[PDB]
Amino acid sequence: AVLNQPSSVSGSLGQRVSITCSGSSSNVGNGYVSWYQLIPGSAPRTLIYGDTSRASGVPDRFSGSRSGNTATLTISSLQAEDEADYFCASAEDSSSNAVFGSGTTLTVLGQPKSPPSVTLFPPSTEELNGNKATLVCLISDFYPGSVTVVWKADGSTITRNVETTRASKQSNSKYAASSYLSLTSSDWKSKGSYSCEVTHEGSTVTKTVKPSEC
Amino acid sequence: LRESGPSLVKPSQTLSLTCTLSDKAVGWVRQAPGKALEWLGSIDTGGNAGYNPGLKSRLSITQDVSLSVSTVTTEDSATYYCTTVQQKTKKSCPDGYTYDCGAARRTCCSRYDFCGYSMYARADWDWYCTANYINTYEFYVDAWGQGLLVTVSSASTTAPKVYPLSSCCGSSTVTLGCLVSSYMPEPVTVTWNSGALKSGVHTFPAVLQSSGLYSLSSMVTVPTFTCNVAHPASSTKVDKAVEPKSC
């Protein structure tokens, strides 16, 4: 048995959002549900216990409700620091047996668009003291969080040996990502220029390193 | 709250952690990567302990709090949390029997004039009274721990080699980094100047090349600087200095 939740919910900043939690008489119908918030890198924080008892430190914007076999959690006056996964929970057939909802990820829209900052690092002397060369392209401080990255070498797109991470939120609620080019030392000194091309909302930022001038 | 234990165990072994006074009820919640929260076990003040029925058989919890799972498999790789639980069971007269008679009789009655009667003392007792009860359970989690990710794998703990990241000498806002390359498994923690430098720091998510080895970078922005990398699976703590290029 598992409690059904919507996969995701989204709203504009300062607004209201609602998340359901549909169970049965064995679990949700038998009493009062519980809610928890998970932000990546942060420990989960209890949001509501009982049908409506606000958490020990949660503000008034969060609200709870229940009608029948489905419970709903409400978030008013949305903020940017409320992007998180929210989990409903309750007990079934035992007071020390718990069941959780499938989870719901909330995203607040309408934040100011920001262009990405790009920094392209050359291989370190110690890494080139083996015979590997890793170029590191660090993308940061962009919104929305969807960039595309291509690598160039001597006016030609590089197809092989490229790995890029998905974008993740920062502490200032802007997005960041990184891309890696993994070569040998002989290949690093083989070509004359390497470029990291980052595309975001129809606009491109390009950084270049030259193995001769580093 | 604080959980402690190994970050990597081989398949078909036992995984044991510990939580770090005794005037509370602590429970263990685990979450596989991307999956939903999964209840494991609780522990009250009196020594009792409630478990997931499906995961009870391979689970235990004993300390003077420390848990233990048996014959772990790849499906046991998860982030294990230590929570502060607050369970409660409340027996209630099945409603209809509007009057809850005392504890001496341990019965519920539709009319109060039948409360001073033991079970089946009166021939009419069966219609207006019963001895059963309605069992309703309440539960939540008072507090949480940060979590300790434990990875189950047949792979061997490979420690990372950290490299400094500095720009080619070719100016208004300096940017340095630290490349933690080729480690296994997750996670690693990067701070700067032992944490004295908190502003302008981002530690990117990890990447996985074809070799199955993780790499990640941490960047710092500034107007010397030493990044501190730590890998618990290899007991490794490196403090590599980032010295800028002369040129």
Numbering used by the authors:
A (entry chain B): 2 to 215
B (entry chain A): 4 to 23, 29 to 72, 78 to 183, 187 to 239, 246 to 269
Quote the authors verbatim:
The four antibodies with 6 cysteines (BOV-1, BOV-2, BOV-3, BOV-4) used three different cysteine pairing patterns; BOV-1 and BOV-2 used, while BOV-3 used and BOV-4 used pairing patterns. Interestingly, not all of the stalks possess continuous anti-parallel β-strands, as shown in the stalk of the antibody BOV-2 CDRH3. For the antibody BOV-2, a one-turn α-helix and a long loop is packed on top of the knob, again connecting the second and the third of the three antiparallel segments. In contrast, in the knobs of antibodies BOV-4 and BOV-3, a two-turn α-helix and a long loop extend from the first and the second of the three antiparallel segments. These four knobs could be described as two-layered structures with the three antiparallel segments as the first layer, and the additional structural elements packed against the first layer as the second layer.
Under these genetic constraints, cattle have developed a unique mechanism to accomplish antibody diversity by forming the broadest distribution of CDRH3 lengths and the most frequent occurrence of cysteine residues in CDRH3 loops. Consistent with the five structures solved previously, the 7 new CDRH3 structures also showed a long “stalk” formed by 2 anti-parallel β-strands supporting a compact, globular “knob”, further establishing the stalk-knob configuration as the general structural peculiarity for the ultralong bovine CDRH3s. Each of the knob structures starts with the conserved sequence motif [CP(D/E/A)G(Y/W)], in which the initial cysteine residue forms the first disulfide bond with another cysteine residue in the knob, and the motif forms a type I β turn.
